[PDB]
């Protein structure tokens, strides 16, 4: 309490700072504006003079510079924190309830949020960038109108680190679920092994045939499955869990899995159980399974069962049964409570130390692509799909750009604004023609969907109505075109407008919580236009360049600033003194005034005699 | 010296050492050698318990950690871990806190490092601690190592590594030229016999501090030392009175009754400013010369009105000075005109001392100071009137006050700065919740009240602490942003503070506040008892039959505020945080049962109905928006009406709510003393209107839920 | 149609919306509960609950004393301060039996800290009574004055710097017949009785603050009590938030799941309001002597000095009273030193009755209060007693079909009782009530309720079907601490982070706290973002910086740059958070060691860190 008020009041005076006397003979006696940067008074009880924080800012902005040495080496503690945070990743958050400085994120009131910090380890820049880009593209395309064509458009309309991603895809042998799905959609060759349950399944012995079986679940729900009959030998490959599995006709006989931690081993074991197509787990199904992705589209029953088991499997472990175990070198058991045991283990699931690892394969196959990106090989088994794509997201060692129409809402609201205006400026000719001819379709363009999110819901229909009326006036008046205004104001009209009487002098866009304001007339921090250089700046980030179209009024009048009114340029003292925007509601048709639009400039305006209508 | 330890030792070990010494309350700056000693001890313990694991068969494998650290944690965690280990393995409970625990050997090991010879340290440690089945690991910087029974759990490689670490550390101290101090600081902690004798006064006091039937402390010590329980509790309970018992009253649905409300004259407004009846003289967009200064803004806002009349009193202050309020209002207007006549107007203008100003403030009505010796012989000299205020009946105007406080305004009252981007999904959920709530409540009247109070209180405090002996004038300004997006500046009235020579935080400054309004105070005069009402103009308002003229009233009232109350009113922004916390807690409570982030369907769904009111046809629901606005309004009302009565009633009624809840879930509840709880709750319903309305809400909820 | 927030509970279970019922969530502005009449009523009630206790006259302070221990057993449900020594000792013995060695380990692990603490440890703490000046004073200045006076009086052993040495110095000074106080030159001679009464004072602006001669002994006894509690499971101290949340769930799981389906379980939540009336320092001394059985005598004396001294505690009486005459419009104030002999016509009926009750105790303007305790000095010992009472509820001790357990933290208590039938539950609750009454533990029947197991609360940790709703903390100040730009930023961001970690602060609420933080910081230091249109003198040069920098995000918030903090990134220092983004020239200028401005919290030694004039 006391310190805050004391500092607030102390900073008020002109010279609240105390500094050594040397500053007298090192910095100018005042500023370029003649402001004094010090005072001759000496601190009580010492020889230090009194100066002002303006001197602090002067030193910060144009003070003498020195070499930055001993700083990176001395601060060895917080730098590692920065590296771990930035190079770390994240994951799905579950509402149920290295790791010594992230406590708030990992644990909360009643939810858990996974996080794996970084450091300087792991794979290279190109592979990680490709994996993350493919993950984002696939995840967004999951919810598109048609994932296949949309995904192709995103892949062909994006690049990685200044290099088109198609070249990397064709010249990079990196393997990943998202990358493999993108390659399959592109029609190239993908790995024979099929990514299921988050791990790569590679067959290396045995075979089976597909049969359609109807099975009654433990919850009294009948599901149709494509059960495989015949001995098969699979290897589950994963970074933190590698396993070797045998399967037979509706029977699991052996599974040896090695993982760094118990969680990965448990995940691999659950994946093996679900892949085994055992009747016992069918009888162990509880509840109604309707798992869907962000697109709410129903998935195949196997994926739903896998998700249900991943949610929890405590009620299933004890149902398998009890069998004996033999003590062997490099052999570990699996208790029902998920704990290794020397004397006992869970049925048909063992744990080894080294496991099956090391050598990989370089085999590729020709595959076909179905409606919703579900990659299926010639045999019939599902190879890949977005349902099996991991949720991990990290950082990009090199800049990655996404010019598509649905990747904009990734870099942030500022990025959304900048990219919407970039799209508007890049398509200036076509957008102008559409606005002139059939603007109704333009106002329904999906490319403006992100902007509708930034504009508050409570004040988006009224904003849209104001914009529609203003643009109708601009169209029906003629002779007063102004491209900058059109680009600035177009995106706000997307909503289904409604009639209103407000005369908006500024519209609000929510960026990073704080709401910025863009003025209908003149320049705004959100939208700046420099006519001296003819450049548009959006929040300090360039958005493109504007070229004046074959319509313009270079002699005053501007009809798209005040609804129902036409501004006639410079003010005239002869007419009625400066009015108020609210008062303008009483002027008669054709009346003129000297309204004060804003800032410190007066503009003469005449009330439109006609009336511009909208749908 | 500590710089070397900080730079060499890894951050985690130094952080653990800092926490450990903070637990014992020892400052590292004063004690330097012990800092290095503790850091080395922790380092050697961790190395002893590093890169060691136990395989699933039982054999020792080097890559379930073989060694578990017990001294690397705090006392509570270490004690819990050792208790659990002993209970599970049935091992003899250690006397002290061991440094490490070996799982393969299932035994507790202690680590010791000394500057002097190892043998003396081992001997003293064994004599002090070792009594049965205990092992100590002893090392030193001299390169000589030994342990108990010549048994080392660590292999040759680990022992050599620890020896090399100690040797390189010793070489570092030798190079730095401070190893001599390190060695000399060690002395073995000579444990000379400690004597603490109670004698003289303390012996008498101790002898006079024993239970009955005891003559001296020594007799009691001997008695307790030889004490062994034998059925004393059972005997006392058998001989205890049967009437003593905590009986459970069967709590059914019919038992509860509504709280008995007090009877008497209706309540009255006591807020620092009007809430439902405030009036604003506003400028849509301040672009005039000299912006930012509250005085110029107030002058400009005043110039927008031309309906001034000759002031006259409609509803007078019954127990107060009516004419002087009028005189001081006239003085305010004349002083403003005089300021208008000036050219070089300073930042603020102090009103000249006048009779009416002093009388309205209360300076001339303030009792003087004199010692009790010179005023004892006074016929009516009594203790301050610490008498319980008279009961006041519930009045409907507070209900309307809250109703209008919960309505939706048409301006952006609160402006908040920016933060970083959100990358984690939990960050996305948090941003979504915050943005939804903010969009909901940013247009509520509660935010208007918050900003008005903050501005008034900050200006008043700055004026009070700026000029001590000046009766300054302070406009009541509030800056907002309309829906259209124009910076509106509203002026509600004026305040004049008294003398502000403040030395204590609780010192009371007296001010006189004049507030505009358009409510006729002859409709509910009882609501207005502390105010003097003047009619200082007429306003033209547009209605379906043109511009009708209605009177413009002014409420003048003398109030007092303390610096701590000023800060409390300057920190009302926390009402938004509290209201969020409430809605977020409800979100989490409803989500946990369903086990999924439910904010998306909580806010956007617009299919939920939370009972938030009542109507003639029955109860009424609303939206999550209505819920958020109601909670924020309740928080602001609680902040403005801060009184012990409110907290008392809330605390005593929360228990009744909980018991009713338990009744709803068929938990078969019971009450030991229901009437006592009822009396405790009703003790807080005497005169306050806010608490009375809360009690009325509680009675409505009681009569509705049990149906 | 008319707002009614309470009606929310008509569909939402109350436990979910409990925050609705916390009106303040802060420090109110009135400070109701401190004065003189409150002390009068406290003393009167303390001596009333010991009505039948034996009366005696003290020999050193020359004041009466009341001893209710072993008095007649209560016959009515009203509060009783008749705590039996034998029952307390039996309860402690049973606690030791169920937890063997606990007292032994506590003693042997605390002897070192008893022999290790330095004198400066007493500097940390709350306000202290300065016998030299006879008024509440900061601990540090009180210590300085005490050492100065003792040095003047030839008691300089405390110069060794050991806390035990200073305690011995205090013992010697108290043994002296009289001492001198030199204030600045005014000399005051305090006799043996005067000094003794001063040293046993309890000032009242932890409502009560003892003097300085009793700080170290209180600290030692509280350290032992904390050490004993640590080994105790039912004890609610000194754990934090997560462990406290887990305690309720663990207790419920233990009591319910293990129980048979036939058995019925119930839970009672109770508040031990006015918890210090019925607990006497003599019973605490008895339990302390029992704890240190077969231990070195010096340690026993050091540990037993505290309750011995407190049993003769003297309570000060507020600042006084204020009288006013409306007829003559006059105001006057009278001190408490003149309250012993003064007319009772000035006061009202209740106040004059209280004065009549407390008249025969005021010694030298300071009442004598042997029985009862004062808030917030021996809380851990009270928790120890409560956990002993709880431990006396096992199936082996009860020797009955029913049984019980629960938690106690000395301010709230919860008890789960289960039995084969409803009559069994009634018998269990009644037996617990009587047993806790015998020891002097008082359960308020007007603020306690019983319901089927699953839903209850403890220390505001409301529990419903495995869900805890911790509401035991208030929101701190998110403002400028007033040191410097980097210092304030670092301390405040660390504050919000720490509150998030433990105090159970929601993420969105943390985000708004950071928002208000940025607002207040920019307003106070006048360092606004370059893009913003706000105007001030500092905005001029600041503006220049905004133009010069090639990376806006690199600039520090104090320098006008954007605030990139968020939930994910809060622990990192602000300077380190923008290290790479900062332009090379800006980095060199900012952290120049040769700057003229420079001759806990985690921050970098930038030029923004200066000492205010």
Numbering used by the authors:
A (entry chain F): 41 to 137, 227 to 744
B (entry chain D): 1 to 63, 73 to 716
C (entry chain E): 1 to 184, 207 to 227, 240 to 633, 656 to 669
Paper lines:
In the nucleus of the infected cell, influenza polymerase (FluPol) uses the viral genomic RNA (vRNA) as template to perform synthesis of either capped and polyadenylated viral mRNA (transcription), or unmodified anti-genomic copies (complementary or cRNA), which then serve as the template for vRNA synthesis (replication). ANP32 is required for both vRNA to cRNA and cRNA to vRNA replication. ANP32 comprises a folded, N-terminal leucine-rich repeat (LRR) domain followed by a Glu-, Asp-rich intrinsically disordered region known as the low complexity acidic region (LCAR). First, it stabilises the formation of the replication complex, an asymmetric FluPol dimer comprising a replicase, which is part of a parental RNP and synthesises the genome copy and an encapsidase, a newly synthesised apo-FluPol, which binds the 5’ end of the nascent RNA replicate to nucleate formation of a progeny RNP.
In the distinct encapsidase conformation, the PA-ENDO(E) packs on the PB1(E) fingers domain, but has only low-resolution density. The C-terminal end of the LRR domain, notably the 128-129 loop, packs against the PA-C(E) domain, burying the N-terminus of PB1(E) and the peptide 152-157 curves back against the LRR domain to contact the PB2/627-NLS(E) double domain. Finally, hANP32A/K153 also makes interactions with PB2(E)/N711 and PA(E)/E493, which are stabilised by PA(E)/R495 and E293 in a network of polar interactions. Another major point of contact is of the PA-C(E) 550-loop, which bends to be able to interact with the concave β-sheet surface of hANP32A.
